[model samples]
Target chain A: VRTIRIYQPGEYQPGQLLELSPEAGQHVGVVLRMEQGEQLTLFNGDNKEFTASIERVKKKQVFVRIASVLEVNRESPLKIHLAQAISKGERMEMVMQKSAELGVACITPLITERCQVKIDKEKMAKKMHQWLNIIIGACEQCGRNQIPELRQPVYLDQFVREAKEHLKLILHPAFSKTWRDYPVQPPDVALIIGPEGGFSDEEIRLTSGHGFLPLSLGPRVLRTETAAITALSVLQAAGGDL
Target chain B: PAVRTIRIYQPGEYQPGQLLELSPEAGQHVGVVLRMEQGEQLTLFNGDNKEFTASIERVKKKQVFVRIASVLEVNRESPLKIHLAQAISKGERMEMVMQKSAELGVACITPLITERCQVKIDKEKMAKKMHQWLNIIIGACEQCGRNQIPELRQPVYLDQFVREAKEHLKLILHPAFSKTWRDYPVQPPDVALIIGPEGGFSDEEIRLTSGHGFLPLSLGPRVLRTETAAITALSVLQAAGGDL
Candidate 1:
């Protein structure tokens, strides 16, 4: 089982004793209650799994000796960059968790004009840290080796200008073309979904003017989370990514 | 239009020009809840004749009666039959599914007991749950203007249900599935949609169901909860089947 994966910058050779942080120690000691010599897997998002054995458990700290490194990857060939508007409460975290599991390469939260949530600079940074941890936990649970990158949220206009993608799509309920109309080959797709209450008509025009193709997911109105998840599923299915 | 509403009727014979009597529940609802005045118009059916807009003839204490006025439209329902074998969910979630499925014109809803289902009620308890769910279906019909009530069946084992379900088209949404709703040829005439529990169907449970001809279909790339997938597929099926 994948547990006790902590990130450290430097590369380590086999048989090197690595110092574990207090959080990792608490995880192994209190949470998991793993005793010394217990085996666990560790990864640094380097597309590899390190089989390590616990050597010592001290006061609020633990140490492990790396046994071997096995290369692993569960990423999809086509990169899906989810540039979604931040939803409220646990909804946004849930989205990030599910998106990481569903093979999103990167996620950039957008502070759209209609977005309901408000956060100061400090709160935003704290929220991003929590979001990062959530995605990492999701990757660990879903057997994904790589955690999708999370970018600090930007305004709608800023995201639109910075989204350099092979194919760009802005979900508009009135659009005609579907995922079926796209080329058969799966390309790196950038999906921009509107915030709750939807993008203003002018916002839609602005995004469309930036060369983002407007697309629709049938007739019925899907809620914000539903729209994002459904649109992602449809795009992946149509492109044979799922 | 009043004439266009398709209302459910229990199976029976009715003489031509006969003034039929409605059950007490339907009577009180029409008279008190609807505030339907005497001489006001309404529709009635027994799942037999074409729906008829009738004239209310009497409004007595706890009794409201109407006479079959004239036959209006016939054959309004889609020929396809969609049976949703939904896993039992929370009170609200199940109710929401029932309501939405009715709006989408599902033919039947059979609650399934799956590995992760949070719902657990014995036969005695099921009787009350069944009544509550059935009411949800009827409530949806009233709102969506569907004349007939979608059939709500007893909760059964997921494995047993898999064996008995037969349809021209069948799908069970699992993350391992490689196909989507659009992957299938235009919507088939009969569809059996088996949805997972709130926590989702287990891998073993899904594998056991693979033999039921319920091809695993993906909704899209996202991991949709059980309810979202059902509504999405039903809508897609409707769109594919030439229902705009």
Candidate 2:
């Protein structure tokens, strides 16, 4: 059986018996139906990873004893900050999951001109909760010890001015340059991707003003979601551990 | 508004001023969903890279007519032939593979049945699934601006596919392999990539594939889902070939 990784979200000590959260307990108790004495890994959003075994499986509570801390991390050396313009419903969630699996440092949901998603205060909180689950689920499945940071949704104009990475790139089909055009590989990168409708001419110009180099991935026009995955893959292949 | 491009898979030669009946499915899509009226321009792709500029001639109760404006020759396809032999996965994962791989300009896709594949389909169901996959491929082509539709081969057994594979450079994605894309030799004319299903390939299956001259290729350390592996492999291949 695969080792179940649970996000406990707090500090823990070795040999300490702790009760998992209600949500996590339901997952381990009801969903996974993991019995007592079964081994599982519990991790905080931070880099700490703990090996634990089930002590009890109750109706609303599942207790586990922390065995020891594990020294392992699956993060890529290339730190990619993907600032993606939120697309439609599941597609946006997909970007979160896939980008997390591909090993991004952080994900910033951007509100662009062509973005069709409307995120108000209430909706933003709900969306963030949903997106957090996807990111965490991807980390558990992909062997990532640390979860990628997900920033609040911001306007493109505001993001361009504040977002700082050694190398910045915006997906532009009109541009002829690819990743190979770069002279030196960047240690940290900020990737700006548009929504389904893509960025407008004015937005493109604005991104350009912020030193976001227009990066093209050949002649074909990849969808916003496809472009995100492909761009991350190409970057990892060139600079990171892919 | 800009003229919309519609890809139709029709056989035979096309001449200017010739009227053709759109398929029922295409007719419903254009007339109902798009609400496209007469004189609206659209592009059609039959096979290969050949495309034709056409305009809506009329809309009937069950048919839509399009007048072929001209035979347009566009080079949107990749020069390198990439045959993606992907093992079938569960649910929408297979469809995602077909869709994204087509967007990356994959030449051909062969759905393989490996020993560890959880998906099972009989002959009748397989035919229906192939038809569904064709629509997914066409959808990708229409979205990605690929005028040429990637050929979708019939689902075959893993051993059968390995025995008949003809690509010059055949590589299989396995995490145990240490070589990266840069380690490969200069680009070849044709490359075939094999991706396992959710459960991955069994040791015997891997050995059988290796016995048939399929070299092991690694994508990296973190485990990638089957669909992700297919897209990543295609992207890396195109980038290495200078197409991406």
Superposed on all Cα atoms, the candidates' RMSDs to the truth, in angstroms, are 8.0, 1.8
Task: Quote the TM-score that chain A achieves in each candidate.
Answer: 0.90, 0.94
List model 2 lDDT by residue over B101-184, tens digit each: 989989999999899888789899899999999999988887787878899999898999999999888888876664788877
DockQ of each: 0.10, 0.83
Query: Which lDDT value does model 2 have at B230?
Result: 91
lDDT against the true structure, per candidate, is: 0.70, 0.85
For candidate 2, list the clashing residue pairs, or say none: none
Which candidate leads the pack in TM-score?
A: 2
Instruction: Work out the iRMS of candidate 1.
Output: 5.6
Q: Which pairs clash in the backbone of model 1?
A: A232-B221, A233-B220, A233-B221, A234-B220, B6-B147, B9-B46
User: C-alpha displacement of A223 in model 1, angstroms?
Assistant: 0.8
TM-score of each predicted structure versus truth: 0.67, 0.96
